[PDB]
DNA sequence: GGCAGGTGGTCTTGCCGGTGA
DNA sequence: CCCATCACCGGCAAGACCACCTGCC
């Protein structure tokens, strides 16, 4: 086993020069530095470790160091360098697994005073080194001070443009901190058996003896890193044209709304308080004020007038002339109340609730103002689509790379339940095909938008989704209570269509949101809102579904007996005594339970997430063992993973058909692997884009 | 005593008024406006002959206020032959207003 | 019995 | 030229809401 | 919230911060 870390001239996306590297070898207990001209030797040392069947430890190596070295090795040395997945270890993956609870377990590190605020709940090397106690100082800070000494101005990340001995030293510090993190993580007896010195074992023993969760997490992080590098073929032109149409409709809605709602004056700027002029008593009914501290009618030493607008001591209310803005919720509330609307529901900060629920229900008198409410609802949705697709900071059009693909980021274990998180941009929040402009948005993401490098023909897409995931996880956990009755009934047709009809709901999506709202403890009023009724129908629906499968109550009761031992409420919060604050995941990991009322969701959402993690891992593994190669220069390419669904690009329709069958086989394999008490299934769709594959 | 202006009457009452006009741009929700109101009620009486006090509510007359760039209230604009001779923003006192007027009158 |  | 105060930008938070699984 | 859960992200509006202006000493 060796511990290493690299430094380069830029992020993976634009890296072109290797600056330095450091390797710590446990067999020699020594550190070795590699400068730019030692790049080849550095690569050799890493391959030497692989040749011995050893392990290489990096912090975020799966996503950065490993691929960066492959890219730079080909660009600078013209060599194919590919460290095998089974020989790589990532302290970031391990840290996100063992310590997923860093937004709460970091409070006393900061309350006491030991971690710099900016690194709060951060898994980064600097953050972790601060917690460990190895921090000697940031490299960026030393570079910044050398530049403030030479008078030169600092630019974002210019500290990495060229190599220097300060970078080399900080690189060595990176490896010492990575070593410290590795040893602190291995000291967790829940994940790594104390009997084995995981720093003195081969890769095969490291994976077989450590908890299954460590292996699943490293395999998931390696596969999702490949998925990120692949990207999602995006139709830039289609979204640019949709942006033009939406902007035109926005301009028209704004024109009609500003015609109906004229401008007005309102206070903006005051930070002082207006107070009674004789008594001096504050009068917080009035808007905030500004009292000048300088000014008069004349200047100082036939005396020349003072033409500034203010007089020292004379208070005045700063105001703005404001044109109606449909994107504001203040303008909407003000104008609608000036039209007769009487707000019912408010926010705990003193502001009436202006969302689609109330807007859809607002009733005024003026027919024109009532129609303007519909123009506002359309404008707000139009704005949501424009912001997500083109104008927002993380807008799709701002993230399209030169390869015509969107390389969205994925944190394999960002959620406490074991689910992943998606950002830059969030490919898991694209508007659904059944929502306004959702089909155009989803159609913009598709394999057809990628033309084969050899034949030049567009690729085909294969979308696979887990059938009723969390409900099947519920059937599994409550099978000991109902003897597998629900696990058998669940496969009698589609569960969601059966629930839709049983509950008398308009759509199958409404049945999904209802069953999951109910299962996870929604109140009567909430179930009514979900179904578009009141608390009466909420109770009816709750007792109808809870009476049909009473084992749900037993499961909830058993969860409480396992996690909670007593409780008491003070103020707005629950004071819980925990027998154990976690759930054992399907792979043995500890799954932090945030609150007793979400414990069932923690149990079910974690199981599905772990099921899905092994599914995507097994699917690709099965494809690879079938001769299929992963990449755009191969046979298939993972394009997106949205919780329980995958979108894979396939060079041909035949390959897509194989991907769909393999995903079904991998799901059945996962079910057999963890001895599930409920049969797991998937549903596949072949098509040109995401709009057709779901 | 005071001339309460309107959008349709502003032109014929302020920009063409022969005399010296002190226009007060105010709003019912402003504190300082309520402070300077009694001061105006007395300055209008004291200067009855050499000046005329007019008031324009920026809420009821939205076409006139924008034309003068109101960025704070109460806004005291001293019009002299259709031209703004002097502007002073804030709830001045009886003495500060007397001064401001005498210096510009 | 316990599962989780 | 410094000090106090004012002005106009840019950046950061927090609120409130909408999108997905 | 007598609590659907887990997530990201957008705009508005208010403060914080900062270079740079007047005006007085
Ligand atoms: C950007 C960059 C990072 N690195 C490596 C070395 C550092 O230890 C590490 C810094 O990661 P950063 O991406 O710079 O992380 P940060 O804390 O500065 O800000 P953020 O987390 O939001 O991105 O990445 C390079 O070697 N070269 C580079 O050009
Ligand atoms: C839509 C939705 C899903 N989920 C969870 C439960 C699901 O098991 C998981 C996957 O969601 P979906 O794949 O959208 O729904 P499903 O898998 O349960 O049923 P099907 O695929 O046949 O349409 O996400 C919620 O917790 N709340 C929700 O509102
Ligand atoms: Mg590193
Ligand atoms: Mg599903
Ligand atoms: Mg899905």
């Amino acid at each position: 086993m060796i511990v290493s870390a690299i430094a380069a001239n830029a992020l993976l996306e634009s890296v072109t020069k290797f600056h330095c590297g450091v390797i710590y070898d446990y067999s020699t207990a020594e550190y070795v530095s590699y400068r730019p001209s030692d790049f080849g030797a550095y690569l050799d040392a890493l391959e030497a470790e692989v040749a011995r069947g050893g392990l290489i430890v990096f912090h975020n190596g799966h996503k950065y160091d490993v691929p960066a070295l492959t890219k730079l090795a080909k660009l600078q040395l013209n060599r194919e360098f590919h460290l095998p997945r089974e020989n790589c270890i990532d302290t970031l993956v391990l840290s996100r697994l063992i310590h997923s609870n860093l937004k709460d377990t970091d409070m006393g590190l900061l309350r006491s005073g030991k971690l710099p605020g900016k690194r709060f709940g951060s898994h980064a090397l600097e953050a972790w080194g601060y917690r460990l106690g190895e921090m000697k100082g940031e490299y960026k800070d030393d570079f910044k001070r050398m530049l403030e000494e030479q008078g030169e101005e600092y630019v974002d990340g210019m500290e990495w443009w060229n190599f220097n001995e300060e970078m080399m030293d900080y690189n060595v510090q990176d490896v010492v901190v990575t070593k410290a993190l590795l040893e602190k993580l291995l000291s967790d007896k829940h994940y790594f058996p104390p009997e084995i010195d995981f720093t003195d074992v081969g890769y095969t023993t490291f994976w077989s003896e450590s908890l299954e969760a460590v292996d699943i997490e490293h395999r998931a992080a390696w596969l999702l890193a490949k998925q990120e590098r692949n990207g999602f073929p995006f139709d830039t032109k289609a979204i640019e044209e949709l942006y033009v149409e939406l902007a035109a409709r926005r301009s028209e809605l704004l024109r009609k709304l500003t015609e109906t709602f004229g401008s007005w004056y309102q206070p903006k700027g005051g930070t002082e308080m207006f107070c009674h002029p004789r008594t001096g008593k504050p009068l917080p009914k009035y808007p905030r004020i500004k009292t000048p501290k300088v000014g008069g009618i004349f200047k100082k030493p036939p005396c020349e007038l003072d033409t500034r607008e203010y007089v020292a001591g004379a208070p005045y209310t700063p105001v703005e002339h404001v044109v109606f803005n449909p994107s504001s919720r203040d303008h909407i509330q003000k104008k609608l109340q000036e039209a007769g609307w009487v707000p019912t529901k408010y926010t705990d900060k003193g502001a009436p609730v202006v969302d689609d629920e109330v807007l859809e229900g607002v009733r005024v008198d003026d027919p024109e103002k009532q129609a303007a409410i519909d123009l506002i609802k359309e404008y707000l949705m139009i704005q949501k689509r424009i912001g997500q697709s083109a104008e927002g900071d993380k807008a799709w059009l701002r993230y399209v790379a030169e390869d015509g693909k969107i390389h969205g980021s994925v944190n394999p274990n960002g959620a406490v339940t074991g689910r992943a998180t998606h950002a830059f941009p969030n490919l898991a929040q694209i508007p659904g095909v059944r929502s306004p402009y959702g089909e155009q948005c989803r159609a913009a993401f598709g394999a057809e938008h990628h033309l084969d490098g050899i034949t030049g023909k567009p690729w085909v897409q294969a979308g696979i989704d887990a059938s009723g995931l969390e409900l099947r996880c519920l059937a599994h956990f409550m099978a000991r209570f109902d003897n597998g009755e629900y696990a058998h009934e669940i496969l009698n047709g589609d569960i969601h269509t059966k629930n839709q009809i049983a509950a008398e709901l308009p759509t199958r999506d409404n049945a999904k949101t209802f069953i999951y709202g109910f299962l996870y403890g929604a109140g009567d009023e909430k179930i009514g809102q979900i179904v578009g009724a009141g608390k009466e129908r909420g109770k009816e629906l709750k007792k109808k579904f809870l009476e049909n499968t009473p084992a749900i109550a037993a499961l909830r009761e058993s969860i409480q007996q396992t996690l909670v031992e007593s409780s008491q409420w003070v103020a707005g919060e629950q004071q819980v005594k925990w027998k154990r604050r976690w759930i054992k995941g399907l792979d043995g990991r500890k799954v932090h339970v945030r609150s007793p009322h979400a414990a069932l969701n923690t149990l079910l959402q974690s199981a599905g997430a772990l099921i899905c993690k092994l599914w995507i891992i097994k699917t690709e593994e099965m494809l690879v063992e079938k001769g299929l190669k992963h990449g755009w220069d191969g046979d298939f390419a993972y394009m997106a993973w949205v919780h329980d669904e995958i979108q894979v690009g396939c060079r041909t329709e035949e390959i897509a058909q194989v991907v769909i069958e393999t995903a079904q086989e991998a799901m059945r394999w996962v079910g057999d692997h963890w001895n599930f008490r409920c049969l797991l299934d998937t549903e596949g769709k072949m098509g040109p884009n995401w709009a057709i594959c779901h | 005593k005071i001339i309460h202006l309107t959008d349709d009457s502003f032109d014929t009452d302020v920009l063409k008024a022969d005399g010296a006009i002190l226009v007060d741009f105010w709003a019912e929700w402003c504190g300082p406006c309520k402070m300077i109101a009694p001061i105006l009620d007395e300055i209008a009486d004291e200067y009855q002959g050499k000046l005329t006090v007019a008031k324009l509510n920026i809420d009821q007359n939205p076409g006139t206020a924008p034309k003068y760039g109101i960025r704070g209230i109460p806004t005291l604009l001293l019009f002299k032959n259709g031209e703004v001779a002097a502007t002073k923003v804030g709830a001045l006192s009886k003495g500060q207003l007397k001064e401001f007027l005498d210096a510009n009158l | 019995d316990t599962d989780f």
Side-chain angles (χ1 to χ4, degrees), chain A residues 419 465-471 494 496 508 512-513 516 520 644:
Chain A
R419 270 190 174 192
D465 194 282
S467 297
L469 189 63
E470 287 173 33
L471 282 187
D494 183 27
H496 294 144
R508 179 180 179 280
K512 292 219 281 271
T513 175
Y516 287 120
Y520 300 133
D644 66 337

Side-chain angles (χ1 to χ4, degrees), chain A residues 17-21 34-42 76-77 162-165 167-168:
Chain A
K17 268 188 47 175
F18 164 88
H19 286 324
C20 61
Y34 302 86
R35 287 176 170 72
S37 53
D38 296 311
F39 186 26
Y42 174 74
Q76 301 179 249
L77 303 177
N162 296 286
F163 161 80
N164 56 76
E165 299 302 329
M167 181 189 287
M168 184 81 262

Side-chain angles (χ1 to χ4, degrees), chain A residues 220-336:
Chain A
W222 188 274
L223 172 56
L224 294 173
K226 172 65 167 68
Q227 177 181 281
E228 294 194 14
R229 275 177 265 128
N230 286 341
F232 204 145
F234 184 73
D235 194 348
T236 309
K237 290 298 176 235
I239 300 301
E240 289 182 321
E241 296 172 348
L242 174 60
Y243 180 34
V244 171
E245 178 190 359
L246 295 172
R249 185 55 180 153
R250 180 174 61 186
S251 289
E252 183 56 20
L253 289 172
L254 185 61
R255 188 194 65 83
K256 285 189 166 297
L257 283 173
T258 53
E259 159 217 300
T260 297
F261 299 113
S263 300
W264 66 94
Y265 284 88
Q266 71 177 359
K268 194 204 124 171
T271 58
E272 268 166 73
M273 183 135 56
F274 178 68
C275 34
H276 190 287
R278 263 189 207 195
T279 73
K281 299 322 199 81
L283 309 173
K285 35 204 153 166
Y286 293 90
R288 307 287 112 150
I289 218 64
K290 167 60 170 163
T291 84
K293 291 130 70 188
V294 290
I297 308 311
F298 302 107
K299 270 149 175 258
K300 304 245 160 257
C303 201
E304 196 190 339
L305 275 70
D306 185 17
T307 48
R308 304 131 96 199
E309 271 152 5
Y310 308 106
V311 166
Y316 76 94
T317 299
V319 293
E320 199 177 344
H321 188 45
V322 290
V323 177
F324 182 65
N325 186 345
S327 277
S328 170
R329 302 297 177 134
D330 200 43
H331 289 187
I332 299 171
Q333 71 82 22
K334 182 190 187 109
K335 292 300 149 219
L336 292 184

Side-chain angles (χ1 to χ4, degrees), chain A residues 336 338-342 362-371 373:
Chain A
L336 292 184
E338 292 178 351
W341 173 52
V342 183
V362 173
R363 295 292 222 272
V364 292
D365 288 271
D366 184 44
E368 184 176 327
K369 292 287 191 305
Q370 178 65 57
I373 298 173

